[PDB]
């Protein structure tokens, strides 16, 4: 099967330049178009440009001209994406996508094969583990909800579990938000029987791998 | 240049039902060079239709595409559970290809009011100099919801952020979390902290509140 494997995600300082690579295997490389497509958080895909490696024919979107370079290495069937002058508007997942092949050959133009994506975050904040705070169940009962707020970490992502994996049914772990400080923040909650609040211990397990941090915090009525 | 506009923004339909998603170009696409893609959360898009009507190998026959100009309908004859996703259209008849803004095809279900919960900041966070107050809206439908923060009856704006979950795979509801952030000094200065929720499933707005230090 045709497979495209991209380089790992990275944080880039504002104003710098990022290079993303895409290693192509599987089949014919040199005579088909490879395209770069990016997708910002909460947005749709945006085509950036493409390359035909055979004679290094390139096509660049108008909005990226001056900042975008696309290259291709036929000796290693690898296509490159270079983006200079970075700003926060370039924070996105970057995808390398190859046009399809139909029967005895023919270029399909449509993007049939996709890489796994490369997450590029253009920001400043240093790598920082989170602060985990409890969201304690109200005394003024009325099922109860409790949770943990995972605030002020950078970069993404943070993982959250409950009771070391033992508690799953009814857990909602929300998408992170970017704070005005440049650090992220997210909330994970669970609903449980009110009659269990006095007898069942609930511990939220937070892991932030970029800072090598993990904290398990007990959440109990105040 | 050619702008691609999809319709509706959100399409809510029932499993097994027939679906038609529309994509319109700001100018005619030459030679029908229009493709449709499916995207599920966290994955790259997957090509469903190319060259207006041609289906790549591996795409089920329930998917079809039509158009002949500026109005391309992707049709799914029988929405299977795995077909609820975001769909994008792309024109590539010119040398500058572009994608539409997406149509979200989601599961239709009975109106459900949100279960609302308010959480004050922890003493531990209060020791850091900042107060985050959290309001949770649990298991509601449709996805539209209004959250207003009131501090001693004063409407807040600009010091909160919220996030929404993907449609739940078991009950087809959404959940929403909103966090109001104040300095500790601004906090404490005030008594009643409240989150007011307006939703289609609520006959009138629901307010949950607490008094600081109680």
């Amino acid at each position: 099967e045709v497979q495209l494997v991209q380089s790992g995600g990275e944080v880039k300082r504002p104003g710098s330049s990022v290079t993303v690579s895409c290693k192509a295997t599987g089949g014919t490389f040199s005579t088909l178009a490879f395209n770069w497509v990016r997708q910002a958080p909460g947005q749709g895909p945006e085509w950036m440009g493409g390359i035909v490696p055979l004679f290094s024919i390139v096509n660049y979107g108008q909005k990226f001209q001056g900042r975008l370079t696309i290259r291709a290495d036929k000796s290693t069937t690898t296509v490159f994406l270079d983006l200079s002058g970075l700003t926060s508007a370039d924070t996105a997942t970057y995808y390398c996508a190859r046009e399809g092949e139909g029967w005895f050959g023919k270029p399909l133009r449509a993007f049939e094969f996709w890489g796994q994506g490369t997450v590029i975050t253009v920001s400043s904040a240093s790598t920082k583990g989170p602060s985990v705070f409890p969201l304690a169940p109200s005394s003024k009962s009325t099922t109860a909800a409790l949770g943990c707020l995972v605030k002020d970490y950078f970069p993404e992502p943070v993982t959250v579990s409950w009771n070391s994996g033992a508690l799953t049914s009814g857990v909602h772990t929300f998408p992170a938000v970017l704070q005005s400080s440049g650090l992220y923040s997210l909330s994970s909650v669970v609903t449980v029987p009110s009659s269990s609040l006095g007898t069942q211990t609930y511990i939220c397990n937070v892991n932030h791998k970029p800072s090598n941090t993990k904290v398990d915090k007990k959440v109990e009525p105040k | 240049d050619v702008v691609m506009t999809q319709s509706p923004g959100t399409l809510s339909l029932s499993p097994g039902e027939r679906a038609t998603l529309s994509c319109r170009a700001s100018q005619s696409v030459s030679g029908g060079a229009l493709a449709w893609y499916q995207q599920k959360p966290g994955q790259a898009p997957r090509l469903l239709i190319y060259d207006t009507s041609s289906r790549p190998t591996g795409v089920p026959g329930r998917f079809s595409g039509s158009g002949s100009g500026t109005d391309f309908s992707l049709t799914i004859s029988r929405l299977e559970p795995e077909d609820f996703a975001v769909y994008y259209c792309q024109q590539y008849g010119t040398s500058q290809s572009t994608f539409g803004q997406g149509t979200r095809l989601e599961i239709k279900r009975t109106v459900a009011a949100p279960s609302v919960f308010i959480f004050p900041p922890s003493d531990e966070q209060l020791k850091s100099g900042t107060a985050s107050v959290v309001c949770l809206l649990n298991n509601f439908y449709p996805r539209e919801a209004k959250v207003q923060w009131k501090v001693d009856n004063a409407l807040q704006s600009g010091n909160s952020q919220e996030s929404v979950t993907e449609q739940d795979s078991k009950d087809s509801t959404y959940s929403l979390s909103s966090t109001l952030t104040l300095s500790k000094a601004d906090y404490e200065k005030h008594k009643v902290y409240a989150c007011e929720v307006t939703h289609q499933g609520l006959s009138s707005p629901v307010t949950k509140s607490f008094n600081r230090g109680e």
Binding site: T31, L32, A33, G50, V52, L54, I57, N59, E99, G105, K106, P107, R109 | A33, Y92, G93, T94, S95, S97
Partner: peptide, 16 residues
């Protein structure tokens, strides 16, 4: 368009 370039070559490597 550029997206058709790869097709040209395909008709070219399709020999006489």
């Amino acid at each position: 368009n550029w997206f058709d370039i790869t097709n040209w070559l395909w008709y070219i490597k399709k020999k006489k």
